Amino acid sequence: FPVVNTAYGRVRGVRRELNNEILGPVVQFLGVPYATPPLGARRFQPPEAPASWPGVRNATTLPPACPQNLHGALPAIMLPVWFTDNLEAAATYVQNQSEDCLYLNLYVPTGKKPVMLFLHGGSYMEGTGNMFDGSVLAAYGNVIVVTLNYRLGVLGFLSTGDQAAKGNYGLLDQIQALRWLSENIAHFGGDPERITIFGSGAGASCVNLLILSHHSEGLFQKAIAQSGTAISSWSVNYQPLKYTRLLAAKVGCDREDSTEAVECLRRKSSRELVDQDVQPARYHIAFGPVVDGDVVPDDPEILMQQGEFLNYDMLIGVNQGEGLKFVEDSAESEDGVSASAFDFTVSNFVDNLYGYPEGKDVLRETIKFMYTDWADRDNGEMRRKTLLALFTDHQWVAPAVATAKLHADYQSPVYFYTFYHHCQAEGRPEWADAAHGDELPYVFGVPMVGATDLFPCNFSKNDVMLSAVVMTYWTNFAKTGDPNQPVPQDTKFNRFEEVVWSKFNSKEKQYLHIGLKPRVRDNYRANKVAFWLELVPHLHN
Template identity: 35%
Template sequence: MEMSLTYVHLFYVYLHLCVVEGKNHRMGLFRSVDVFKGIPFADVPGKFEKPKLHPGWSGILKATKYRDRCLQVTLLQTKTQGSEDCLYLNIFVPQGRSLSTGLPVMVYLFGGAFLLGASNDVAILGDSLYDGKEMADRGGVIVVTVNYRVGTLGFLSSGDARLPGNYGLWDQHAAISWVRRNIEAFGGHPDNITIFGQSAGAASASFQSLSPYSRGLFRRVITQCGVALSPWSLQTRPMSLTKKVHRHTITHTNRTVVLTQKALTSDVWPVSVDCVVMDLLELAPVVDGDFIPDEPSRLFHNAAQFDYMAGVNSMDGHIFAGVDVPSINNRTKDTTVEQVKGLLAGLTKEKGDAAVHSAYSLYSAHWGSVPEPAVVKKTVADIETDFLFLVPTQIALQLHANNSSGASTFSYLFNMKTRIPGFPRWVEAEHAEDLQYLFGKPFSTPLVYFPRHRDLSRYMIAYWTNFAKTGDPSRGDSKVPAPWPPFTKNHQPFMIINHQISKSSVRYGFSCVLLCSPGLPSVSREEEETGN
């Protein structure tokens, strides 16, 4: 087993006359990772203002501890945490026998519904889930994780010039710009930057690629379980939400305005039969005529220059389906036809009753005359996965391929069996379960994983970092278990990602029932899942 932190020494990096002090973590024989934590990429932001350049510092900046997350509510929404002084990033630089230079750079944007999260979120046995040491060491890339404003301070908008919104997106843009200006001092290549993210972080990466401000700023994009087209990723009625927030806010000081618990829980919204959890995910980016100048679906010409890789987890929607239809996780209670139709009504209410009947017919076609209870419950999870994640991602992939000017496109489905205890046996890959493998947790905390998990982690790090190096997940320094063909206008393969990847893991077509573009392929989920 490889151990981190067996030996630590200090070193310095010079940034335009500013000195940064970090730590070196030993990873193996002749291998280590230099870690810098808490480097400011912008000044303390004004409330509801774009980020400002940081003035720099005199002396030596000790970049050895994570800084505060941006001010936000806690997960249970009972109190707040964090600080308005929060625009910091962390850098993980792999080192070998010689000092690293010209390395590819991967900038990670965290998820959290645009409401929660931080660059050092979710500690796993002492280390952040987003700790980049394993990925940097095994993949030979520089990993950067960044903070950005979330919640009301990051995404509240009036829909006009008074409060344009998208402050969190501007923070991300400022961080990526800082990386491009300064990463060469850390051994990185400023012309080979990949941005990647998961969930709201994936939607953020998608928005960054669609913005006209990103031209020439980075080279590649990876979105995991979220895109700018996701139904939860864009606030289309910002003033309505702002008025609602105004009725439920408290002012802690003259400089701190946050949502109360009530403003983010169900007592703000009228309870109705067609209310679904997606209706509560209201804080999000907006079309501001500036950073996002138009509807996202009409901006893919701006992303034509970027290589793009995107995918979802096979049961991304399960956790949300469990809120909308709690019976799916109850071993002693069946899920009824009425509940399935109620969920479809909630998800398609803008399309009317005809859409409900049509979707129900398609999703229940494989049930048989007397469907197994587990089949019905799994169908509920499939419905929510399709609506929230799969279909928008497939449309984004198709739009990218259609608009591409020589850039590559790749599609995947992550379907490793869930490791979360207590769920029914039919549950596969939950939302965010891919992250533990991508960030190498099976290697850094080996006692809580099995060899198959380390295989999967090795495969994911290889594919992801190869893509960052070359624009092709199959081509690079890291060995992969099978070639991954590109997604094109007329050819839509996707790679099944699990611990048993082989040539047969490449499949064609996805189930597209809800909101499916006429140009997208459609196959049954039975065909899709034969690779499990």
Template identity: 35%
Template sequence: MARLCKQVVWDFLKVFVCCELYVKFASGQNNQGDVYYGQNNPYQTYNPPEPGDRDYRTFTYNNRRYSQYQPNTYYNSRGQPGDPRRVNQDPRFKYDQQGNQEPIYPGVLGGWREDLQGKMRPDSIIKERDVFVRTRHGEVQGFKVYLYDNPDPDSLYRPGSESIEREMGKTIVFLGIPYAMPPINEGRFRPPKSHKGWQLIQATDFGPACPQPIKYTGASKGVRDMDEDCLYLNIFTPTIGSVAEKLPVMFYIHGGDFTHGASNLFPGHILATFYEVVVVTINYRLGALGFLSTGDINSPGNYGILDQAMALQWVYDNIEFFNGNRDKITLFGPGAGAASAGLLMVAPQTRHIVTKVIAQSGSALADAAFVIDKYRAQNTSRVFGQLLGCSIESSWKLVNCMKQGRSFYELGNAEFPPQVGFFPWGPVIDMNVTVPYYEGWYEKDWHFIKDLPENLIRKGQFNRGLQYMAGVTLQEAAYFVSENSSLAPDFRITREFFDQKIREFVLRYNYTLNPNGTYEAIKYMYTYWPDPNNETLIRDQYINMLSDFLYVAPNDKMVKLLIEQDVPVYMYVLNTTVESFNLPHWARIPHDIEHYLLCGAPFMDVEFFPPKLRFTRNQWTNNDRNMSHFFMKAYSDFARYGNPSHTQILGLHFELATMGQIKYLNINTTYNSTILWNYRQTESAFWSQYLPTVVGHLVPTYPPTTEFWWEPREPLQIAFWSMSAGCLFLIVLVVVCCMLWRNAKRQSDRYYNGELFLQENDPDSGVDNARGAEMYEYTDKPRVVQTTGPARTISTNSFRTESAASLKEPTSEGRKGTPLMTTRKVSKSKTQLIQGVPQTDV
């Protein structure tokens, strides 16, 4: 009895201590963790600065960049981050040179982070947290996240169905592992460099997102931090240590049109824990910092896609330490992520790594996925340079301005005018440029793909064990309407608006060879002829037009190419929505709607997601939970077995697509889906086959008018052309001097070339005009020929030269005067030498 009472008292004390700690901890926080310091806090609520704010900054420690945001009530601190009154601060953690050298703790080490650990519960602070893993680059410290829901429909669990929340699983999380050196200073507009390694990295917080427009950042949007030092990846794994079999790896590449997005927007906890895969998410450079291309050696481009390739290589080299199977790596992602996965699938440096691809509403064969027009890339860069006030006289001046004279904030926040195109930035084909060696960068580091992805697939240049899965939604391009504020609140589209958008579309995509014919063809294809003036149907057709061009037709083309190469292909079309979102009927199934289903949002604490979404724990319907389970199970089965329905999932299964019968799973609900085939083949053929015959061919854009072949593009070329110009000037100068010297010599030779013979009056001195019998002498008047008498030669004062002694034979023509045969006669001349200068009297 005494033992029982003792046990009861001990259990009561443990519960009391946990409740006291929880109340003490929670009293200093609001729902978002922004109230830091308790009820007597003199600072009240601290709202950390966000990207774009004047006092926003990050800090570095041990080659790792962390956020300034710290809910530091875990250690009963006082004051805002950096306040000298804060206690329990680790002096090793310092702000970088952008800050004030103030110490704070990074990530979850500084306090409970609801955005990283979920809702705090009474026993949270006594649960095991820290995990350490040693990789090829050094030791990494992560932490455990505990989950309180189960996605298995057979569990019959629903939030709130039990009075006490039970732990259903746990995920081991490593956030912000650097996979490359920071692409700052000299690293801007250059390929990534492999990380040199570390002793210990605190992977306890997401790394900053890469620079992007400020409208996509902020704590409320889920992107709390932003910095040019952004090349980090995150790993979610269910176990650490020895296991019987390594787990498949799912490598997530976020979308965002290559201009915005971040790795932390995809929480992989549920997918990793309950479906036994290792989930990896990455950041990569976006916008101009990731894809600026001048078509020459000043900025070849492709930095963002090269970041992805380096992250993939890092995972291939290190994922085994996180219980991942390096031979089962599946790439997946929406939009730009799907296009990137398709490019990495055929890229020479990564094709051996990629065994499976899941393309969510994207294709590497889309117009914006891969730019093959050099002048289009150049002109995009020039327009961007004009927005920033940089010189566009030459590509070197443009790149130098953006590299030396503009901050990453300016480069990330600048946005294009609408006429540039829907997706201005993206990977470009190699321009056959040879880049000189820079310290740390080799020629091979700059190159990505030298041929069209379509040609590489036809040549079979991909992993021969490749398996492919693709999907699209019913209303992919609905966001073009819903995000157009000028159409709010009714979002009506008139016939005039539709016609104008088609004309803009024709000009925007360079269909300039036959613009009227192209316009008429598109208008004919997407006019609902039974009721052409119905604005509701016009809006639907406008969405269909953009969806087919941007997503459906490129996806169809990729699927057919891979089927021709005997690659197993599975396909789905999403025809249902997230019911709890209550979207309008014309935008119920937009682009990437399956994102929240795939990351297990119905089973996670709402604190993991951006506050802007305003999720609630009980908002999800049974169908939402079932569809979330279906997608996670299908994707993980495909990563593990190469078949998305290795076993039936809630009664659903996929079938292989074959040529002539491109079968796909038409997903309505989990209990009302069917296998159909040949999705929108007429519309896809219109864009892939028919329209190019109307256009003739896609006319390349015109080259920049200020680019000339001789124009210097970088300092080495400036030095070369300067030296060449100097050498040319010296050569011309030498030639001119030689000509002047020759003319001067001819003038002086007048007196020695036989046309003028000089004699002194004094027969004892002067010029001896005696020549051989064959010589001629010209005088002003006739002379008498002397036939007798020796000719006396005075050699001491003679001006005769060797040339005067070798004159040619006389001719029948002579100059004015009488030619006389000299007979060695000494005659007086009217020419005299005065101070050594010949003077002649006329």
């Protein structure tokens, strides 16, 4: 039970030991506050510094999670596959919901060590940071993995568009946890000048929105964005006042005055606000990051094109097939999806995503022709793989390449990768590969610790080898900034020895094809990526 004196008092951890023999013991400080709780009048206000406590504080038990409703109407497509499949197992973690969230979990192993802050969340109104045990990652890579809880949903992202409720309260909590780390990690042994930030899904969009901000000026140095970006359709909210008024009407006080409505919402209880069941438009979000002027000044799209950011390092990537939830109705059919429904599915994809009345018949017919296999036009079974790739390319792959190019034009080291592996789960078909959010088990060393309630995968030796490689690639980035130099790719127990990860250049757009058969490719779907970035903007507008 080591005691480490911080700048706000003293805490006490534990010395829990991992189940492996090649991993040393770690010291865990679970439940370290980093902001005064927004229990009362602090709701819909930015966080502040914590209050110092006398004596020594218990830090052993996992902290309570921010209020959320895991059995409501959450956006299903945004969530990772393992979150939706194992919903009952994931609901056990979020049981002690309370507004006294905003705690911090530290996993210190046993020069100053690096720090790796993890921004959780598949959507903007679900999840908690207790699901990810970073003890294995911290011990293997000799880094200090830290996971946090931040306000979610209405409580942390409600905005009206005016000064009454600016919004982005969840983003300010993430910045506050970075400021706390920049001032208190030296005692635990970390280095405040080598702070790495990483996430996945909606957390990855928070990483990119944190980069294009002035509040996070000199807090962290590097960044990782796994299967996420800040220019997707479901990244930022462009209709904040509309969804607030629907919420205000449902609770009971839809006052005309913006200030009056906000004050009433502060009077109501937390559970009443969370369980209101407000549903947004398809492929969008209801409550999320809102452009206000402080955190996100004007627009994520405009911000990167104007070159206004502090030039951080980056490590972007995507998976093979992430639109696995785009094709779900035709998932138990003997032979794929029929041509009657392929046209209807593609047609619906355009109204609720483009919907432009300035010429749509040409746009609808152009993408029907391109996402086809004219050499095997009447296959039928592979129309699923084509429809799955239509959603993956448009929503994930194309924005990731556009972000990598914009971050590499202004000189900044950028590393691109594609994940081509998954574990044989229970309820997933054998034709899909590397669904959304499937890189998390390997980056956190799940196969090296065994099966988990969230991951019922039966990991073989090949899955163990891949995890020891992904963690090595990720950790080397946090140590020096290049996934190759500080640590070699040795078995320590293999085609990973001879491969060198090269930078992503705007004209030589190389990447690393992570998998069981790695290879440094040259261009990821250059035909389909260029279709969405070059041709499509010339069709509707």
